[PDB]
Amino acid sequence: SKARVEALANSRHVLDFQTAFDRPYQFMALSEQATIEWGNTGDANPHAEGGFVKRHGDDSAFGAYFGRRSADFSEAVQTVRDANPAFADLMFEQNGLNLFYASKMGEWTWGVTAKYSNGKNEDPTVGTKATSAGVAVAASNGTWDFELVQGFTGKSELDNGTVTAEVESKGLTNVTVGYHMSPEMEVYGNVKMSKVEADLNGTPIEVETTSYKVGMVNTLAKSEEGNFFYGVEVASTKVKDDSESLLLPVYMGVEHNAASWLVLRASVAQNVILNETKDDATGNKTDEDSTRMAAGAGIKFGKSVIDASFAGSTTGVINANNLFSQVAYTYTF
Amino acid sequence: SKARVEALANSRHVLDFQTAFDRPYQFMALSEQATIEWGNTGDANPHAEGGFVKRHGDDSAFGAYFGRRSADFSEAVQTVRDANPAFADLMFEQNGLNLFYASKMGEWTWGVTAKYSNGKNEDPTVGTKATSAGVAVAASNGTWDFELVQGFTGKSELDNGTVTAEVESKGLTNVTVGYHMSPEMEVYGNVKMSKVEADLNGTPIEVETTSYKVGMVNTLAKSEEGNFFYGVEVASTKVKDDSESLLLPVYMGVEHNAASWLVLRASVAQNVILNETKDDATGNKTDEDSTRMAAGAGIKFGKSVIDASFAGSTTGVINANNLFSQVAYTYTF
Amino acid sequence: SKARVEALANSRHVLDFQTAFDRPYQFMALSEQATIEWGNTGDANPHAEGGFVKRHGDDSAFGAYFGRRSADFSEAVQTVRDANPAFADLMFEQNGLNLFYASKMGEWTWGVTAKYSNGKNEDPTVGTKATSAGVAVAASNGTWDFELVQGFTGKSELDNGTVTAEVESKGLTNVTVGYHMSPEMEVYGNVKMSKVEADLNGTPIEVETTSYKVGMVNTLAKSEEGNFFYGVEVASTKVKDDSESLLLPVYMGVEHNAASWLVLRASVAQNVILNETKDDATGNKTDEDSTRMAAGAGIKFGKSVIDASFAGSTTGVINANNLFSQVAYTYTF
Amino acid sequence: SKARVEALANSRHVLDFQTAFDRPYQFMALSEQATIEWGNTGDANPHAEGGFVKRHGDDSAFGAYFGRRSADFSEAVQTVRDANPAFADLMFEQNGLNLFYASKMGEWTWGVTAKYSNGKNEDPTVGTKATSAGVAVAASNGTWDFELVQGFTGKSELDNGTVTAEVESKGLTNVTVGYHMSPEMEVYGNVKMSKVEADLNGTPIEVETTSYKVGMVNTLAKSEEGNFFYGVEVASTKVKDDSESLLLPVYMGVEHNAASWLVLRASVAQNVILNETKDDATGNKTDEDSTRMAAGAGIKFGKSVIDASFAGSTTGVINANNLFSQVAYTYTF
Amino acid sequence: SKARVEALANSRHVLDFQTAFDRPYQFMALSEQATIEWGNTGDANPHAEGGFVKRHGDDSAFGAYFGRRSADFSEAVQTVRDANPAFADLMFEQNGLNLFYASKMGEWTWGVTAKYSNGKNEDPTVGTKATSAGVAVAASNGTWDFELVQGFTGKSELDNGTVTAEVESKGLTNVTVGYHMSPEMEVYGNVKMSKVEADLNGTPIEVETTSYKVGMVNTLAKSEEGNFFYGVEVASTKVKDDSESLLLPVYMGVEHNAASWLVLRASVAQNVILNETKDDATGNKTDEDSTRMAAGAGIKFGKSVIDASFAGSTTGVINANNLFSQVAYTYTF
Ligand SMILES: CCCCCCCCO[C@@H]1O[C@H](CO)[C@@H](O)[C@H](O)[C@H]1O
Ligand SMILES: CCCCCCCCO[C@@H]1O[C@H](CO)[C@@H](O)[C@H](O)[C@H]1O
Ligand SMILES: CCCCCCCCO[C@@H]1O[C@H](CO)[C@@H](O)[C@H](O)[C@H]1O
Ligand SMILES: CCCCCCCCO[C@@H]1O[C@H](CO)[C@@H](O)[C@H](O)[C@H]1O
Ligand SMILES: CCCCCCCCCCCCCCCC(=O)O
Ligand SMILES: CCCCCCCCCCCCCCCC(=O)O
Ligand SMILES: CCCCCCCCCCCCCCCC(=O)O
Ligand SMILES: CCCCCCCCCCCCCCCC(=O)O
Ligand SMILES: CCCCCCCCCCCCCCCC(=O)O
Ligand SMILES: CCCCCCCC
Ligand SMILES: CCCCCCCC
Ligand SMILES: CCCCCCCC
Ligand SMILES: CCCCCCCC
Ligand SMILES: CCCCCCCC
Ligand SMILES: CCCCCCCC
Ligand SMILES: CCCCCCCC
Ligand SMILES: CCCCCCCC
Ligand SMILES: CCCCCCCC
Ligand SMILES: CCCCCCCC
């Protein structure tokens, strides 16, 4: 679930339905299961999602998933929307669909995820259309992880007889390699590039981001009760003619099976030493407080698990108005 | 209960007091029971409802229910009311009454549900009259379902000193055939034709709707624990000289006995590939997000069960203000 | 408790401290107990109340009770108060007092309940005075029930230097006879007449109401777990030179011992076929939706029991701002 | 705790840290304990309080307590504060301190409580000073209770350079004698005389109240489950040249050990027959509804007990916004 | 955790991750653990914090901690911020880092805590820079405690082209000596000295504070369940040419293992006899109510512990809006 992965800091050691989309060999290690992210239709946060992963014989898995929206796509569209209130109708991805398949052939597991979305409102006063398509291919043997995420299409446009807007992807590539020395240690490198082009009612805009990350994650000698982990990552991010950040996030956390009905999840992070963002023009530096934490739970009823975030975590409260948020339901067959 | 059927995506595999009305042979399969939908008198959502089903012989069942309102009826009345604040007194069905009977004679079980409602307010500053009457007849032998739902009468009129308005069913027919190749699989076909004439203070309105549906719902090999299910339905709807939609809803869900006191219910759906509503005049297409989900619980105290929806399901939360809504109570003798 | 009798639809099969006032032989059948209705002093809904019933020998019972207000009295007083904001201080009964006694001679149990109240505020800007006095006499042998409720005095008057109002009872009789063919069935009939004169700042008013009720109540074989009941009653009410009503309420409900700590209560009722009120002046008829339900609970700690209503029953909701209302506390010795 | 004594209607039969201050022989009967009344610093209701009682030999006890304020002192200061917003800074007792000591010398237990308070704000725009001092001496032998409570100093004054105010005790004496015919019955009498003077920016005021109470309280035979009790008291109060009241409070209640973790407490009272207050000037009588109840719990964890009032009692609700108020914590060593 | 230390009156008898920073030998006595203080990034209260302590051989411990902010530093910044809204951006410490180490050398355990922080916003409209560095050195043999906390750097400054502001530490020294006659008694003394200089847009300011404290703290002979404690301390504080105070805080509390899943924490305090603050200029004295209390809880799931304050402690309530605040999560390996 999203709440689980978030409380676990999105760390690379985590195995989850939600991390498998972009690491599809993981679909082969997951238990057959159905999961539903609670939320609403349309422009809603959380947005309703859900799907399943099934085993097909001994050496492969497959499944489908409804409603998943790309982080990059939704960010771009929201930036346009926030630019001018006339762009309020610019679409997020409509009816997102994922298909995925994984197979273990001897010592290597490989997998593939396909992403497609498409929709339109041809009402003249709205006049919107959006499409996306992409793929993730990956393989692993326990020691080596190879992950490739490639966007094919990402476009959203608006034209209502008053204004016009559009935003489009001119390339999305995410490549990751991981090396696991032992079941407790992993090191990883990652390179990401996206090009986005927008036209807001005449005015063109471009954004090009390139980011390099090198990191390591450690876990403890496997406990039957507590997965404790810690990590360090160096992250270099260049927005063309905008800015450049060099960040050293240090993080740590735990997933603890605290009771027959309860999993507790918590983690904390801070950028240690390296926290600067520099302006390409002025060279002025922003270097501000970055300490952050996360907390959530799982309520276990055997095959049924209700995951959530502690809604009060950012304010330090557990109280009946601030209990669970980002709820998901997972049934493991 | 309503909340249970809704958390299970209204799938045809469900057997429930609330699914029995329009599939009256089901009344012969339910355990003798009394059920009450929490709510209020009058123009309230939820509206108070309640009834029972009792075994007559070893091969028949019968009972009565109070307060059921037709969905078609309430939609028509509410559309009219939304037309203009002058029509805010247009009545919904008053004092709904249902009687139903079911008998297993051979390998064929058959059943009948009669619905009637009638009310009026003759205060001159109000002056309103509403009536409805309908039947449902059905039979099944486990392999084949035949269900017919017939509207005989539906009329609501408003005549005060200032404005008039009326709305009236000119025919409501609903026919379903189902085939069960096994206990796990059903295919079903459904045809629905309805015509509605209304008068909004002189101006006349006419809406005619025909829909064709073909679908399949599968359940896993029956276990004492977790009823998982998925279905595919293709649905053509034609509103005369108005619009045409062709939708392919896909859904899955689970009913799990999570604890001796706890039933958990969840489901997710999306229109896959086919999601278009075309406007008749312009030919403009609407193709927008369809993802939706549902979550509910049953709290179990032996013969008493309290059913509910997770009120926070559309916003992803569970907390003191968003725990249980659409509550119902059922006593199984 | 009030919430218990309300959740059990006020049915005549109920034995409760709260149904005994107007059926005083019941005080012989109750267990020695002290009950308290949570509320406030003064013009508060709910109003603080409470009393006890104690055994004297094996053949008599007696007790006293504080705070009880007559339904008819408060209805009268509220009608006046609503007539105009200047009658806003017209009093309800002040410091209600009830005393009661019951004795079982041979096969007959008889009892009497005395009600008296009296209060005044002689502040010149308030200037109010209210008094009431009445009695209940009843006998029963298990098969026949004879109940007389007689009002002696009921007056409430207000005179500040600005306006005057007074309401006064000119007669209040209630006679009920019940017949029990078995412990599972009861038929009964009831005549009630009441006359009330009021003066609102000069305008005189008279209301005279006469009602006849014949009804039936059945329970299922006395069980040790679930007490299911249903009833039918036809009720004719005449308000002289105002209104006539003929109503056929049908109701049904359950009291279930759902756990060692929990009693669940629920009922639903509707006017079936007969639901008509006709203005005597115009002959205009009102015939509007009458479906209604009620839900409550008892939290059991051996000799302590906390009764309540599901505060969210009318909205279909159980959450943390809508849990228990109408709380009462009963200690059974 | 305050909530405990309050839920038991302040009955003379109760033994509690909070009743011992003015009945110091009780400090010898209490179990060594530490109690903390939850609250805030300053002009806060509830105000933080806390202290302890400790045994010395087998025949003596002593202890201290922080934060206690006199009801008469707070009544006086609040009345002045309410006379005029200019007097808003008039001080309640500051840093209240109690020392107490009890000893048993044969059949007689005796004890004394000393109360001191003192504080000032010499800021010229506040200019406040307040002081109090008093003693309680009492002795009991089981059959006979002698309690004397004597004020010594009671003064609060304000001089901010724009208005002056002061209020001052001219004598506070309160004498009680009780007789216990048995462990179940007590009759008691009480005389209280107080004289207060005040200056409200040059206007002088006096209040001499004198009161007589004779009462009786009964409990049932000692049972380790549910201590039931009732009482009646007649009380005559004369506020010299202002008002007179004659009041006959009748009350009953229960403390029930309802579970291993739960103590339930409830009581109801009403003035019966005698409920009159007469304004001395005009002779105008006020005689209004007096019914009132109270309810609380103890949550027990062996040596730890959290006491509270049911915050929803005056409105008859129990829900997660109206759960516990007037919380206190008590550790019995 | 902070809630734990606070509910325990911040007493010197408490051993906690939060009291070790300034008593680093304690890091040798703490069990290996990770802790997270729930909160947010940036100018937030509570502020996300967290870290760990780990053993390294049998005679040493080390670890690290993110997010901690000096109370003196935050006080200085906040006072400057309050002086003028033009200083709204004056930074608190950014990305606080703590490293600590401790070693048992025979009968002596010694430890060291290093604190460093640094951040900046070079946007010309913000123009802020902040830096801090400090050390704590301490050692103990179980009988003698020696603690030195020393501030090296402490500066925060703002220059946005419109206003300037800065605050700087010209010295921070904190020495404590403690003596333990037994495991139940401790006496201690403490001297603290600090000079802070500031410039608010050309207006200079200086604040030199010196304080002395001598205290005693006691616990009872160790139970396995209920740790009770009480202390007295006398504290003299002089702010050069501004103010002085002499205060005698007396206090008392308990940490009780109330259940396998619950720790209850409560204390209360008041300044007894000595409570005066003199204005150096006018010689005027302030001497106002000082009673205060604190209540918290630990929820225990074996190695996981969720600590909190009772959010409603200052108003005496436990309800669903006021349950737990200042939450922290601790995993003991
Ligand atoms: C417990 C002692 C830790 C000392 C760390 C000193 C490293 C200096 O690095 C600085 O880290 C901050 C963090 O953001 C940066 O802002 C500075 O530019 C660095 O020099
Ligand atoms: C990643 C799975 C690939 C599925 C691709 C299906 C191709 C077309 O998909 C549908 O196209 C229509 C056209 O509007 C959309 O409305 C549907 O939602 C799509 O599923
Ligand atoms: C399937 C049951 C049909 C039997 C009802 C026939 C006549 C009922 O008369 C009306 O009953 C309604 C309730 O639906 C009342 O509200 C009306 O007042 C009656 O006229
Ligand atoms: C339940 C019947 C018992 C009779 C009550 C005694 C009659 C006395 O009435 C009192 O009248 C005074 C005023 O004179 C009221 O203030 C009291 O509340 C009454 O009890
Ligand atoms: C509208 C322009 C914004 C940028 C859009 C980038 C392309 C988005 C499409 C994502 C496809 C790749 C995802 C692989 C599988 C998955 O993660 O679901
Ligand atoms: C105001 C009219 C609008 C159109 C509404 C037509 C529906 C009225 C007929 C009632 C249908 C009842 C079918 C019997 C079984 C059931 O209870 O569903
Ligand atoms: C304001 C005047 C309206 C008239 C109301 C009738 C007043 C009569 C009150 C006494 C009737 C109750 C006596 C029987 C015992 C009981 O029900 O407590
Ligand atoms: C402040 C203006 C006058 C108001 C009345 C003051 C009443 C006297 C206060 C002195 C304290 C008496 C309490 C001693 C009994 C005890 O030990 O609790
Ligand atoms: C800008 C305001 C100046 C405030 C001056 C006081 C802070 C300077 C010293 C930093 C704190 C060092 C604390 C060492 C041990 C610890 O508590 O972690
Ligand atoms: C198995 C857990 C025991 C009870 C824990 C309750 C936490 C609120
Ligand atoms: C069925 C074991 C206890 C479950 C408690 C869950 C409540 C959040
Ligand atoms: C089944 C052990 C106790 C569960 C406590 C649940 C508290 C929410
Ligand atoms: C009596 C077994 C536990 C039932 C718990 C229900 C609470 C929602
Ligand atoms: C016996 C387990 C019952 C737990 C109740 C859960 C409350 C929501
Ligand atoms: C199993 C002990 C009784 C539970 C009482 C709960 C009431 C809310
Ligand atoms: C199963 C023991 C009692 C559970 C009480 C549940 C009420 C929340
Ligand atoms: C193990 C503790 C018993 C239950 C305590 C419940 C308090 C609300
Ligand atoms: C029988 C164990 C305690 C039940 C506590 C329920 C509190 C709501
Ligand atoms: C598992 C023992 C009782 C738990 C009670 C929890 C109350 C919130």
Numbering used by the authors:
A (entry chain A), B (entry chain E), D (entry chain B): 1 to 240, 241D, 242 to 333
C (entry chain D), E (entry chain C): 1 to 333
Task: Provide excerpts from the study.
We were able to produce and refold Bd0427 (aa 21-353) using dropwise dilution of 8 M urea-solubilized inclusion material into a buffer containing either β-octylglucoside (βOG) or dodecylmaltoside (DDM) detergents. Refolding, as judged by heat-modifiability, allowed purification and generation of several crystal forms; herein we focus on the best-diffracting C2221 form (2.8 Å resolution, statistics provided in Supplementary Table 1). There are five Bd0427 copies in the asymmetric unit, forming an unprecedented pentameric OMP; from hereon in, we rename Bd0427 as PopA (pentameric outer membrane protein A). Distinct from a regular cylinder of uniform height, strands 1–4 and 14–16 are shorter, creating a “flattened edge” 20 Å high on the inward side, considerably shorter than the 55 Å outer rim. Consistent with this, the inside of the chamber is lined with hydrophobic residues contributed by the barrel surface and lower face of loop 8. During model building, it became apparent that this feature exhibited strong electron density, into which we could model ten octane molecules, representative of the tail of βOG detergent. A second region of difference density was located behind the α-helix of loop 2. Refinement verified that palmitate fits the density well, with the carboxylate contacting the side chain of the conserved R88 and the acyl chain situated opposite the bulge created by the disrupted β-strands around S189 that opens to the bilayer. Fatty acid binding adds to the features (general fold, β-bulge, plug domain) shared between PopA and FadL. The three small α-helices of the plug, along with R32 and R43, prevent any potential channel through the barrel of PopA. This closure can be quantified by analysis with MOLE17, which confirms a constriction point of 0 Å.
